A = this chain, B = another copy of it.
Amino acid sequence: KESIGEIMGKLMQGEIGDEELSKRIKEIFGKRLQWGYKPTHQQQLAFNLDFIKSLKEMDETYELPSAFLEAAFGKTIKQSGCYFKDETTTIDEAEEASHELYCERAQIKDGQTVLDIGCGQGGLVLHIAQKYKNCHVTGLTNSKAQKNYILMQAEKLQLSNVDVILADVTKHESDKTYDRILVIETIAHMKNIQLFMKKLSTWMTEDSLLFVDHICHKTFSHHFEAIDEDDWYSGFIFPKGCVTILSASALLYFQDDVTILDHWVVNGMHMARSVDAWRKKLDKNMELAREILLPGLGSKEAVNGVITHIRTFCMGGYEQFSYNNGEEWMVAQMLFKKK
């Protein structure tokens, strides 16, 4: 069936079954792979360097209710890839394992000041604060709801070492420095990477470390947007075209102000299992979710719309991160010091 509008129409009517939906999104990702892989390393580097150089030239009131977030995501409402040891690891255990991975790779130690940039619902902030009672942990979010959620959770867990800065990170100005800065799956939303990294360095001292985790492709970078008129998916998921997927090594070229100390990647099956867990939990709590959303949304059809958007994101994320057994799209992690 041709035509964006036609596919979008059937999709919203629940007339496209899971199997065909998955098959359709997978073919969309297959075409991005064809766009991204060049025949020789000479050409691959030319293409990658052109993307990086273009980056270096660059310079909604409605928020889902937290009770809905609790019904779709895991216990700490982590909205980033989790780490699954087993086949039977639950989303709650995978959330905790990923928190501990970050603490290990970012070399968190009791006593440090820690800043978590774009902290979301604050799972990582709460984890570090609870495990390391002499750390002072600051979250930074541009969401008032997120701030209020984190502060409430801190109060319930009897944590006294948590604060939250409410700010757009690109506009925030401050003299404060921190021993540790964490940036977990936020960089994909950052429009000016060179400026972002530069600002981060001014919040560091000679003893600080910076840890960044970002969704990536192992070989090439791309904007998350349609290649052609056959791709209904990209523009449905991110209607504002400002999500960038950096290659696993792209940040190596942004060492004006920071210097790399270590670099890892985590296979895409972890992310795939994450989104699959959210999809399954959402499906299980579907009735409850629709009831929670109805008030603030107004119509049963607007509810259906928000649910379709979220569920399709999950189905598409599955196909993207599980491609070739997790060896295409994945998560890259880097550790830096100030330069």
Binding site for B on A (CB under 8 A): 40-42, 45-46, 49, 218, 248-249, 252-253, 255-256, 259-260, 262-267, 326-327, 330, 339
Q: State whether B265 touches A49 (Cβ < 8 A).
A: no
Pick the contact of A41: B40, B248, B259, B260 (CB < 8 A).
Answer: B248
Besides A41-B265, A42-B266, A45-B265, 19 other CB < 8 A contacts? Answer: A40-B267, A40-B327, A41-B267, A41-B327, A42-B264, A42-B265, A42-B267, A42-B330, A45-B263, A49-B263, A49-B264, A252-B253, A252-B255, A253-B260, A253-B263, A255-B255, A255-B339, A256-B259, A339-B339
Give 8 A-B contacts (CB < 8 Å), ordered by A residue: A40-B326, A40-B327, A41-B218, A42-B265, A42-B267, A249-B249, A252-B252, A256-B259
Q: State whether B339 touches A264 (Cβ < 8 A).
A: no
Shortest Cβ distance from residue A304 to the other chain B in the assembled complex, whole angstroms: 39
Q: State whether A41 touches B330 (Cβ < 8 A).
A: yes
Q: How far is the CA of A265 from the CA of B41 in the complex (A)?
A: 7
Q: How far is the CA of A42 from the CA of B330 in the complex (A)?
A: 10
> Which label, helix, strand, loop or mixed, suits the secondary structure of the A interface?
mixed
| Chain B residues, CB < 8 A from A259 | 255-256
Q: How far is the CA of A41 from the CA of B248 in the complex (A)?
A: 9
Shortest Cβ distance from residue A273 to the other chain B in the assembled complex, whole angstroms: 15
Q: How far is the CA of A316 from the CA of B121 in the complex (A)?
A: 59
User: Across the two chains, which residue of chain B brings its CB closest to A53?
Assistant: B262
| Chain B residues, CB < 8 A from A46 | 264
User: Across the two chains, which residue of chain B brings its CB closest to A262?
Assistant: B49
Instruction: Tell me the number of copies of this protein.
Output: 2
Shortest Cβ distance from residue A262 to the other chain B in the assembled complex, whole angstroms: 6
| Chain B residues, CB < 8 A from A49 | 262-264
Q: How far is the CA of A145 from the CA of B171 in the complex (A)?
A: 60
Shortest Cβ distance from residue A172 to the other chain B in the assembled complex, whole angstroms: 25
| Chain B residues, CB < 8 A from A339 | 255-256, 339
User: Across the two chains, which residue of chain B brings its CB closest to A216?
Assistant: B41
Q: How far is the CA of A218 from the CA of B43 in the complex (A)?
A: 12
Shortest Cβ distance from residue A130 to the other chain B in the assembled complex, whole angstroms: 29
Q: How far is the CA of A45 from the CA of B327 in the complex (A)?
A: 13
| Chain B residues, CB < 8 A from A40 | 267, 326-327
Shortest Cβ distance from residue A210 to the other chain B in the assembled complex, whole angstroms: 14
Q: How far is the CA of A330 from the CA of B40 in the complex (A)?
A: 11
| Chain B residues, CB < 8 A from A265 | 41-42, 45
Q: How far is the CA of A330 from the CA of B41 in the complex (A)?
A: 9
| Chain B residues, CB < 8 A from A267 | 40-42
Q: How far is the CA of A294 from the CA of B266 in the complex (A)?
A: 60
Q: How far is the CA of A330 from the CA of B42 in the complex (A)?
A: 10
Pick the contact of A252: B42, B249, B262 (CB < 8 A).
Answer: B249
| Chain B residues, CB < 8 A from A218 | 41
